[PDB]
Structure formats: structure tokens, C-alpha cells
């Protein structure tokens, strides 16, 4: 019974648990993505103001 329990617990965990390494890799990729996106948006914010030159 104890061997059965350890095997089934391992299988359930690896089914239910997630791998932290891929989690943090994806988190870093997404964090850099959103930072680039918001800097992008801030840069794009001023683009329409260029036409104010010939007011």
C-alpha cells in the first residue's frame, strides 16, 4: 500500500503540479513583452502631436 501511495501521489502531483522553471521563463518573457509594449505606447502617444506644427 505504501508503494502504491507513493507512486500514485507522484503521478497525481506531476499531473497537477507545474514546473517552476518554465513558469518563470514565461513570466520573464511576458514581463519584458509588457514593458516593451508600454514604452511603445508612450512613444506612440506623441506621434499625432507632430501635425501641430502647421497650426
Amino acid at each position: 500500500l505504501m508503494n502504491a501511495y507513493e507512486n500514485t501521489q507522484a503521478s497525481e502531483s506531476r499531473i497537477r503540479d507545474a514546473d517552476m522553471a518554465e513558469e518563470t521563463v514565461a513570466f520573464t518573457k511576458n514581463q519584458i513583452l509588457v514593458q516593451s509594449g508600454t514604452a511603445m505606447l508612450a512613444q506612440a502617444n506623441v506621434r499625432p502631436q507632430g501635425v501641430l506644427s502647421l497650426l
Binding site: A18, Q31, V34, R47
Partner: protein
């Protein structure tokens, strides 16, 4: 030039927030550490995990 709207900025916002909910669920999922936290991720996996939890108890 057309100044009443900035559609490009709106689309950038759209992709930004669309990534925002994904990064939010990612953050909660590694905070819990579980790849399944609420239904919709994998209901079959959730049911199997519950069955195995009952089994181990």
C-alpha cells in the same frame, strides 16, 4: 491629417491588455504553483487530480 482618433494606439492598447490578463493568470498560477487553479485550464485533469487525491487519502 486625421486627428480625431489614434487607432494604432488603440490596437497597441488592445494587444497590451490582452497580454495583461495572460500575465495575470500566469502570476497567480506560479504563486499557487499549480498549473490547474480554476476550471477551464483542464477540467479532465482537475477531475483526475481530485480522484487521485481521494485515492491517496
Amino acid at each position: 491629417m486625421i486627428i480625431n482618433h489614434n487607432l494604432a494606439a488603440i490596437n497597441s492598447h488592445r494587444v497590451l491588455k490582452f497580454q495583461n490578463e495572460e500575465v495575470s493568470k500566469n502570476m497567480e498560477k506560479l504563486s499557487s504553483g499549480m498549473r490547474i487553479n480554476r476550471a477551464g485550464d483542464d477540467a479532465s485533469g482537475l477531475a483526475v487530480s481530485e480522484k487521485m487525491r481521494t485515492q491517496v487519502n
